[PDB]
RNA sequence: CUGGGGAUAACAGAGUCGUCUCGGGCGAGAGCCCAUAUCGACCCCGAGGCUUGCUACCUCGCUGUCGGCUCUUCCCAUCCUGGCCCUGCAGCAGGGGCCAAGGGUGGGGGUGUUCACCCAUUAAAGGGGAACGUGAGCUGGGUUUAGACCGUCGUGAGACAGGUCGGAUGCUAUCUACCGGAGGUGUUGGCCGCCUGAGGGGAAGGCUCCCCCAGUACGAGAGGAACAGGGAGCCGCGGCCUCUGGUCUACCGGUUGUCCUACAGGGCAUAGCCGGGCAGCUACGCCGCAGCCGAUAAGGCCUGAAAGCAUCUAAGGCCGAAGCGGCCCCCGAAAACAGGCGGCCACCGAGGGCCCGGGAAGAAGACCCGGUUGAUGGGGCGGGGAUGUAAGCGGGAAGGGAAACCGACCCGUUCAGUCUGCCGCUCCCAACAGCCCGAGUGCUACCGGG
RNA sequence: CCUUGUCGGUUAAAUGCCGACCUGCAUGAAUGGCGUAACGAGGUCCCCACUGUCCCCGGCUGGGGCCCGGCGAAACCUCUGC
RNA sequence: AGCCGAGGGAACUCGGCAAAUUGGCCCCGUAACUUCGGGAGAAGGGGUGCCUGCGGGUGUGUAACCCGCAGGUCGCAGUGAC
RNA sequence: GUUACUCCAAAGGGUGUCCCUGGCCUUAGACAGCGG
């Protein structure tokens, strides 16, 4: 007999679109400092630089080449506190605090905002609150958290969720909610320049596609072409068992799926559109913007190499949940040149 | 970082991009795109064309 | 160390393009009997079914002598690949390419035959086989 | 040709296992001597059903087939990859055996071939099952029609489980199955949003080379290792378009033949042919893919009796694998204990759909952003890009003609003109006018207040 | 037939093709024997050139397929259908 | 049913099936073998547009159809498509 | 093992455990340790 792997992997299935297009996180990694352990951002475009080598192995210490994601990130509103408590077989939600002045466009997704709800009531839901976290009865601590997208010009409506604190304790957790509720938080006060990140995202639609396209299966020969059957697999399975199984490559949809993507160094983080190289200041913007995506007006980050997702998309990023052994330093690359030329 | 120059229009283009062409001899040329390196090898004369330097150049020698 | 003082072996930084396959015909750019090659086979290359080895510069491959001097022809030798047609990144980014593809004949450990390799050949040959930039005049 | 037959063969099935493949007991004898490192006769005892036969239980119009290509899955009697024990094991290796089926096991030459033979590589290039897996999946080389040739046999018509040339390949999917997409009812009041995660899937990773260790231990010399540490690639998996290549029947230019009278601008000839090409799609391009904790197998040990000694086992401990479980990724409230939290309505109206302008999404449905609290589409103004310097006017031009004047092409006006399935500013036109679905009833048997 | 006979040439590698041999199972002289220029939509082996046949597939066009309006069958069919 | 495809060029397959290459006209030059008629368009090579002109053949012909040469110039490409 | 039969493995072996039988030993036996 011959012997070959099977055509595509079986670890991605159902193969079927994104119950959502914010995308969702479902675990959280083991850090110690006391932080919020993410942010998110709209993609803008590539580009590529030329640095130094910071990363183990030879090429270390050469002027190389590294293609780049840039990722815009306005602030985030911290609007929410929820506690959890742990149950029959997992944690169950325990309470929630919301803060009373939002913004009008939150109604955009969150029909059903309440009514009366003054500082009165947040200051006591608050205390409350605390008086159970003071109990015993709590195990993790997390944040609410919205977007806005007014301030680069994207959208109204925006998008909620939900995020994780550091730490083995809850009352540090809840010490620094309370100091966080109700403000803004910037993606410099969170992330570090030269972290490893872990990139969740939502990828980009094909549709409907054939077996050879979407798993990978060989076109057959030139006289099965001339028969009306060269983009087709031969066999659905044999005689017995005398079912289909689920094992055997079709079509159907390709695209749209929830992905997510290991150690992606972060290498730079920008302020009001401007990167400052250690000589001058400098944008990022090329001449005549970025393709189908504007101008950058706020805040963004560098990430090494490429991510899931269509531009305008919406990101999610945390630090690394599967590192490696031997890490790169944290701290901003030497970088000798940035691309500002036409990507069109 | 050294921006480079092309040997068909004769101007400088960035680093990350481009094309450098040996010859069996040890001569070497560089090339800014597919265009110039194709009208190059096809045998079109960057003298007569107003979006190159050898335009200029031969301007001098009218 | 063990034996580096002489040795013939290196290690280069690029690792070009997979260009010329099985049943590629190849000129022979050094003194040797031999003019023409065809590749027959890549050393330190497996596979999977249906596909062809494939070889680019710095590689060696068994061959065979097509056309050649008569003590030489219809036997089967060894090559390192010193230039090719198809493109191939440099480390700033910038690409690089020849006008033909040559080869030159070697023993199965490395040590050359032939005293002259006529033309130019790329950097990385010369990086991985430490012997051949001790023959040719060019190395770009 | 007809009429019929599974009362009767070839083909796969069932039955059986002489043969077949894979094994065992005993100890003759061989191994410098030494029955058991290895080999084990003569005789005796078996497993499997992957060879072949025997029988004739199913099927004579269900389908009659060999090989190949494509595609999925399983067994272990293990070829490599992990871990160990004996050696007639110095090292490098070899031979023989135990656990282990997670991954891999490829490319070519003649032949219709399966197998077998050969080449060059390789960590190694294992053997089998699935209706001798797979023709409502392809092909059609072989074989079993009708044509013809040779050799033998035959008085002849003619035959050959002998060779050779040639010789039809049908389907609108009724039911189930699988891949993907939607609409309902239920969850004992309805609707927003955000979370838990019962369970299910996973190879998401597998292997090789180089430096060093070290010309070191071992070895008379020849030769020649290992643990730790650093790096690189092949096969596989999942994504992206900054760079490089391909296409680009958007767009720009050059040119042939003919027609619109000639210029200019156009139609047709596969976009007429040629060259270049942005967005978009794509790979020949580029980015990413942990070893750690737990319990075990073969095996190696401690304590320790039966059996006052001894003994890894009987009872009890400690270690110990690419294998099992978890950490990690994908799906997932129809998870029938049919969940948890916050908020808004009900006991006119919270919310939702149609409709309008569009795509980052798309076979229909669904999905996403916007709708005058407005830059969603168009336009105008500018930026960037693709081609490559428009028509007209003025001057020159090989040469010709009395002269007026012809004249392919060239220079200037001109980084020009044409175009933009790209960005920005700006309310100049249009996102108006509206229309429909919609919870709302209670009792005893109650739980805790009244 | 034993047969992929043997020796040589052609290939990295030859159950092939070509050239010699002869124990012709079972050649042979008008059921003609040996040759043969030119011819053949005849069978067969090699070389050069050419290529998406293949490595290994990708992009584009027109017609269908899909939605909408209209006309409108049949083969098949014990009942059913994990 | 059709158009293009980098680098390699039959490694595909029973088999180079299918597709591609060549392609009109003038000049040069053309083998083995041969039934001396052929092979033979063997093979292999160079040239080919537009413009300005100069000459020749037949003819009474600044009617008509044909045959040779120089110079200038444009393009990746002059049997430019068919 | 939970099989009346229909439909279910051997030769060869076992200080695994529960029992029958018959010899030899025993007031110093059968192991140990101390020495000849
Ligand atoms: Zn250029």
Same mark, same amino acid.
């Given at each position: ?27 959280? /990694?083991? &850090? ?21 080598? &910071? ?18 990130? /306005? ?92 730490? &083995? ?13 109700? +403000? ?19 990828? +980009? ?85 970025? /393709? ?15 991510? /899931? ?36 | 970082?050294? %921006? ?8 400088? #283009? ?16 560089? #090339? ?18 107003? %979006?190159?330097?050898? #335009? ?7 | ?138 190395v770009l």
């Open positions: 007999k011959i012997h070959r792997p099977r055509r595509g992997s079986l670890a991605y299935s159902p193969r079927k679109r994104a119950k959502s297009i914010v995308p969702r996180i479902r675990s959280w /990694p083991k &850090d110690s400092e006391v932080r919020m352990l993410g942010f998110a951002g709209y993609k803008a475009g590539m580009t590529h630089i030329l640095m130094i080598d &910071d990363s183990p192995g030879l090429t270390k210490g050469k002027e190389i080449f590294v293609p780049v994601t840039i990722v815009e990130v /306005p602030p985030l509103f911290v609007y929410g506190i929820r506690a959890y408590k742990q149950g029959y077989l997992g944690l169950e939600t325990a309470t929630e605090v919301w803060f009373h002045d939002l913004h009008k466009n939150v109604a955009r997704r969150i029909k059903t905002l309440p009514k009366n709800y003054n500082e009165e009531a947040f200051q006591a839901k608050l205390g409350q609150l605390e008086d159970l976290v003071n109990d015993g009865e709590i195990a993790d601590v997390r944040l609410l958290v919205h977007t806005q997208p007014w301030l680069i010009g994207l959208k109204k409506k925006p998008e909620v969720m939900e995020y994780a604190i550091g730490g &083995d304790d809850v009352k540090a957790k809840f010490d620094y909610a309370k100091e966080k509720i109700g +403000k803004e938080l910037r993606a410099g006060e969170v992330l570090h320049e030269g972290e490893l990140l872990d990139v969740i995202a939502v990828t +980009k639609g094909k549709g409907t596609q054939g077996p050879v396209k979407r798993w990978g299966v060989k076109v057959q020969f030139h006289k099965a072409q001339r028969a009306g059957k060269g983009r087709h697999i031969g066999n659905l399975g044999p005689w017995h068992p005398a079912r289909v199984m689920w094992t055997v490559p079709q079509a159907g949809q390709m695209g749209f799926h929830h992905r997510t993507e290991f150690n992606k160094r972060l290498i730079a983080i920008g302020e009001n559109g401007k990167l400052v190289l250690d000589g001058n200041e400098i944008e990022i913007t090329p001449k005549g913007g970025f /393709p189908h995506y504007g101008i950058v007006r706020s805040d963004f980050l560098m990430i090494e190499g490429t991510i /899931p997702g269509s531009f305008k998309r919406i990101i999610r990023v945390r630090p690394a949940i599967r590192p490696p052994k031997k890490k790169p330093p944290v701290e901003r690359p030497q970088i000798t040149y940035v691309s500002r030329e036409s990507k069109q | 970082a050294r %921006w480079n120059v092309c040997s068909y229009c004769g101007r400088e #283009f960035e680093p990350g991009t481009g094309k450098m062409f040996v010859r069996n001899d040890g001569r070497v040329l560089f #090339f800014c795109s597919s265009k110039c390196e194709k009208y190059y090898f096809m045998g079109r004369n960057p003298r007569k064309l107003k %979006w190159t330097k050898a #335009f200029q150049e031969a301007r001098l020698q009218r | 160390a063990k034996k580096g003082a002489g040795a013939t072996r290196g290690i280069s930084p690029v690792r070009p393009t997979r260009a010329l396959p099985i049943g590629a015909y190849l000129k022979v750019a050094d003194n040797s009997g031999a003019k023409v090659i065809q590749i027959i086979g890549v050393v330190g290359y497996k596979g999977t079914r249906r596909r062809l080895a494939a070889a680019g510069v710095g590689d060696m491959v068994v061959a065979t002598v097509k056309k050649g001097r008569p003590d030489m022809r219809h036997q089967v030798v060894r090559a390192v690949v010193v230039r090719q047609r198809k493109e191939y990144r440099r480390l700033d980014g910038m690409r690089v390419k020849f006008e033909d593809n040559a080869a030159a004949i070697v023993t199965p450990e490395g040590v050359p035959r032939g005293t002259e390799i006529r033309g130019a050949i790329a950097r990385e040959a010369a990086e991985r086989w430490v012997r051949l930039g001790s023959i040719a005049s060019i």
